């Protein structure tokens, strides 16, 4: 009866300014977020070209990737509303010139 | 005003103990124990890192 | 008995098994007098229930007894019906089986 | 409950209902008498409680109170 | 399991409990009976207080019945429903029940 | 996110122009030259976001209203404003102003 | 029968941690001085901090410049964590910042005008992915904490102004312990601050405040 | 630079024999608690004075609390009566000795009895007990002086019922905090003290004496002189 | 309560914990078996920090008590109490027995 409420409640939780990882998790938060289109998973493996808080550029080494276009883009979404009037904005992680792989954040 | 450990750090929240036993959501206690542990392990690394980087 | 009939007035008198009367008719009980019932060994008396009042479309201030909420004889104007109604089904949210 | 309570007043008048009506009549009387000259109601209490105080201190003797309605 | 938590607590340099000694902040004299402490992740729920206050003095009224609106979206007006009538009855509170049904 | 709209009523077209009597240039100060708030103004609890007006008629005003019109030479305006104001108890700032015009014109 | 304490800065250590001491006390009064020091040291000491900022090509907090890995609100949060030291009688002034680099804009790049001080020299303010211009100001002001309620919203005048809330009091931890020496005790107070004040000055200031507040009970008059 | 406020309002009020209620007004937030703790503790446990410590009745011929004596009061009652005597010593002397050596005929007993030593001043006329004119009796009281609360380890060690030491005239502090407002800022404090003493000193001046102790314990670190000016 | 004469404002959850806690006893504690004249004495003592609050002491009391029949007889003497319970002696109004 108590875990029922503990589960029904943590989905009305309101996000805040600076996200802080839990210190006692269950290794499942790695899965939910990745498995919902709020993150930006790199399609092809390469190196960061130029990143700023509006878009990301990735040049792909075609040697170890299938036929590609040598450059792809990802456009960030700053302060887009959502049905409950909560702010949505993605923030980049990577730095200039980093080795990333297909299926990373 | 909050209670504070001997070191000097104060405590943020003051929950109530009478809740837990009656409505048997024990797991919260064990979560607090593990959390204390993690917070100790943090201060350890900090001490080792406040010198000789 | 000394708890079932606390604060309810007495229909008629009560005679000792030794002969002398003990409590008269129309004598509202009270935790002083309710010693005098288990004292002398009594186990049955006649009290004034609202089932046996005689007033039309109402209730007299004696066939009902003590207010049981202010410890006095019921003042005239207390809508007793509503009180008794909601003091029955209210705890019902708890009695389950 | 600043100073006076129903437990006090219930000693002179009775049934705790008659109290309501009698105090209401008295407070209405004290109100319509133009007591509202406005240099007093900001230093003391509303007449609704002045009447209760008056009945507690046993000054008015509500047997008298009704005799102020014929004074209407 | 428990003993793992406990070995970790030891590594950290804490009692083999959660419990520890605390001091009041208004005096400094400690509490007896060492108290539990910990981290205990916490959340805030979407039931803020800014959108539940809603008082009202006088506002619009219902077209077909001439009664106040309801919901704090327009201007509300708190439902003084049926069960609250029996309450004011049992009290014998005639007046406050009367003008609760006409003047208001 | 609020939104105001302008319809064609049977007395005429209503207007969102920043021109409404009985309104100073102070409550209007945070208004641009087009009837719409700036992008950045920290609006308050009850200021104008877009200022509108709608016409009316059928005064046949009371004798006392007539007199007081006749003292201060108070003219009776045929229009009434129905602007858009933040409801009380709120605050904040502005981040985007979408405006959709008319068709076939 | 006469003991009176003197104050000593024994046992410095760590980043900005210290252990101040008062050598002789009255054998019983120690645990009063300890608590008073702690509480007044945690509530009233005033410092200086940034309260209002204006960035160059910005209009509000939820915005974004070009070639900046950061955001505007992330920048405003960075700014709050700068440790500023002001001199005796400044009480208000202006800071400036204009740069044309292509790396990490640390707080050391504030203009080295008079009076001011910037202790937290490592703290990043923003990261410029590419070379570009960047400029802003920030009004530094003295102040003390008062609670989340009795704080005035710090009026804004210009267009791009952006209020920044300010945590003034420079104390982070206090804890005391009392040691017995025979008809006498010694008080041993831990203090940890951001580095914007010196410990001895700090404790002296706190005791000044405290005795100032006590000095009414010597009179039992109004003032 | 906003000039931490000052009380600016006092309402002294006496309500019993050696008892008074002071109330202070408009103190900055939380200050009330610190100023209450300091005041209460130092006024209670760090004031100089003299007080009785030990009682010997019949030179040791009363061992426990269950021994009849030729008067109306059991031993416990006499101990409790004598423990209350308000004595003022002298600076030159460092110990007193109250002697209630009595053999009369069923009399009333008070402080105006009891041949003493030099330097004492019984300060009152508290009643003790009622003689029964029976067999002989004696009472020996020991009086010392100092500061602090000296706890007695054992109750009756050898031949004297030992007590613990008060060493103060102030017998009660019991302070409290309430709320008060000075306008737009309403989170402030309002303190109320309730002191009850023994008679050796009127309450208020005892309060002042305890405040002077603190304000005197910093002269080498603060300027207690200029704080007076204002 | 209108349903039954039982009161309805009794302390409930941890107002009860504290009372039950400070009103227990302990066998070997500090200051055990001491002597005190009145409540203020026990207060002064306990704030000094020598006694354990669960100790057994002896207090001499004297106060009126109301009888059933409207009498009010005096009660006095020495009673073996606990340091905790005496701390509650102040709140009990004159009229109820200790
Ligand atoms: Zn009947």
GROMACS .gro file of C-alpha atoms in nm, chain D residues 2 8 13 16 18 20-21 27 29 31 33 35 38 43-44 50 55-56 62 65 70 72:
model
   22
  257UNK     CA    1  -0.991   3.748   2.498
  263UNK     CA    2  -1.890   3.264   3.275
  268UNK     CA    3  -2.883   3.316   3.225
  271UNK     CA    4  -2.695   2.873   2.652
  273UNK     CA    5  -3.136   3.228   2.569
  275UNK     CA    6  -2.755   3.407   2.231
  276UNK     CA    7  -3.084   3.587   2.179
  282UNK     CA    8  -2.575   4.432   2.129
  284UNK     CA    9  -2.945   4.816   2.126
  286UNK     CA   10  -2.517   4.945   1.837
  288UNK     CA   11  -2.746   5.406   2.012
  290UNK     CA   12  -2.198   5.427   2.015
  293UNK     CA   13  -1.546   5.611   1.612
  298UNK     CA   14  -0.926   5.115   2.140
  299UNK     CA   15  -1.171   4.851   2.268
  305UNK     CA   16  -1.931   4.419   2.521
  310UNK     CA   17  -2.406   3.994   3.111
  311UNK     CA   18  -2.115   3.821   3.284
  317UNK     CA   19  -3.163   4.020   3.142
  320UNK     CA   20  -3.307   4.355   2.895
  325UNK     CA   21  -4.076   4.801   2.504
  327UNK     CA   22  -3.847   5.051   2.127
   0.00000   0.00000   0.00000
